[PDB]
Amino acid sequence: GETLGEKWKARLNQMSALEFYSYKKSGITEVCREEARRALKDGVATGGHAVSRGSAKLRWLVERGYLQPYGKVVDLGCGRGGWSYYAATIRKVQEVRGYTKGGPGHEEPMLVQSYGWNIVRLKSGVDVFHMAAEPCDTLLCDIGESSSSPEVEETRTLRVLSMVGDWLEKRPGAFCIKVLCPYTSTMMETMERLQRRHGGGLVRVPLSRNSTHEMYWVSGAKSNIIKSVSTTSQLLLGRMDGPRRPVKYEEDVNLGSGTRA
Ligand SMILES: C[S@@+](CC[C@H](N)C(=O)[O-])C[C@H]1O[C@@H](n2cnc3c(N)ncnc32)[C@H](O)[C@@H]1O
Numbered sequence: 001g002e003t004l005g006e007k008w009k010a011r012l013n014q015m016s017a018l019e020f021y022s023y024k025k026s027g028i029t030e031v032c033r034e035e036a037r038r039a040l041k042d043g044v045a046t047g048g049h050a051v052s053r054g055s056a057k058l059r060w061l062v063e064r065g066y067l068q069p070y071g072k073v074v075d076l077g078c079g080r081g082g083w084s085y086y087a088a089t090i091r092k093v094q095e096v097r098g099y100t101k102g103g104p105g106h107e108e109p110m111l112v113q114s115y116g117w118n119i120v121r122l123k124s125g126v127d128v129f130h131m132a133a134e135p136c137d138t139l140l141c142d143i144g145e146s147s148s149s150p151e152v153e154e155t156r157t158l159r160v161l162s163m164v165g166d167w168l169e170k171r172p173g174a175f176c177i178k179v180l181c182p183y184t185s186t187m188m189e190t191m192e193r194l195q196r197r198h199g200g201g202l203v204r205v206p207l208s209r210n211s212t213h214e215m216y217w218v219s220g221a222k223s224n225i226i227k228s229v230s231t232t233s234q235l236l237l238g239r240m241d242g243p244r245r246p247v248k249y250e251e252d253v254n255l256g257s258g259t260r261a
Helices: 004-014 017-023 035-039 054-065 082-087 150-168 183-197 224-238
Strands: 029-032 071-076 093-099 120-123 138-143 174-179 200-203 215-218 246-252
Touching: 004 150, 004 174, 004 224, 035 224, 071 082, 071 150, 082 120, 082 138, 082 150, 150 174, 150 183, 174 183, 183 224, 200 224, 215 224
Parallel strands: 029 246, 071 093, 071 138, 093 120, 138 174
Antiparallel strands: 174 215, 200 215
């Protein structure tokens, strides 16, 4: 039958514009980047500003031990490079290689001089679905385009997991993989089978908007799949019910500046 997340998705799609706008950010955490945007647009590269919202996302996981990056970091779907630049500041990290689609209507890699920028190399014009897996120590992937269709979201997620599968054959010790749609029955079953092989678990990052059920498959988690997904689904459902809570604003990550080693 219908899962809680599938219930959540249907209710989400049935919302008026007003109810949706009121819900999307109710009680969530958010980093304010109006300062970062301005400096970056002005061409400031040494201010320690993150290139995107994603640095704070990855930081939330790493700070809590859900992820311990090290060695060669591969960042699939790196966009502007928020995850790559953050990882560059982590001690045991020696190399960062990001790959992203780029092109019209898609984020291009950004060049800044935040701490450890010298071990970072970002590559645009790359379809990771066409890229052969390589050796890596830490595997990051943040691919998963949202959609109103639960069918599309499900299919898109399982295609990413199929693609990530080949990279996981190389046994990275650490990983962080975005799972756009983890709430269907098939998806929970799939993740369980992936867990008993590769380990890790699903984690909800509070910086995510309420309008998405995205969770992150991280090597440092050890929780039950169904229980973790169900808990998140209930939270998102609960927030649809009143009251509208304000956004918990935090200050964005600062990544310092200068070269490493
Ligand atoms: C949600 S963004 C995450 C960016 C990054 N995590 C950050 O902190 O800035 C995902 C990125 O993956 C890229 N992407 C989506 N599909 C891709 C594909 N098939 N191959 C390469 N990149 C892809 C998109 O262009 C998008 O910029």
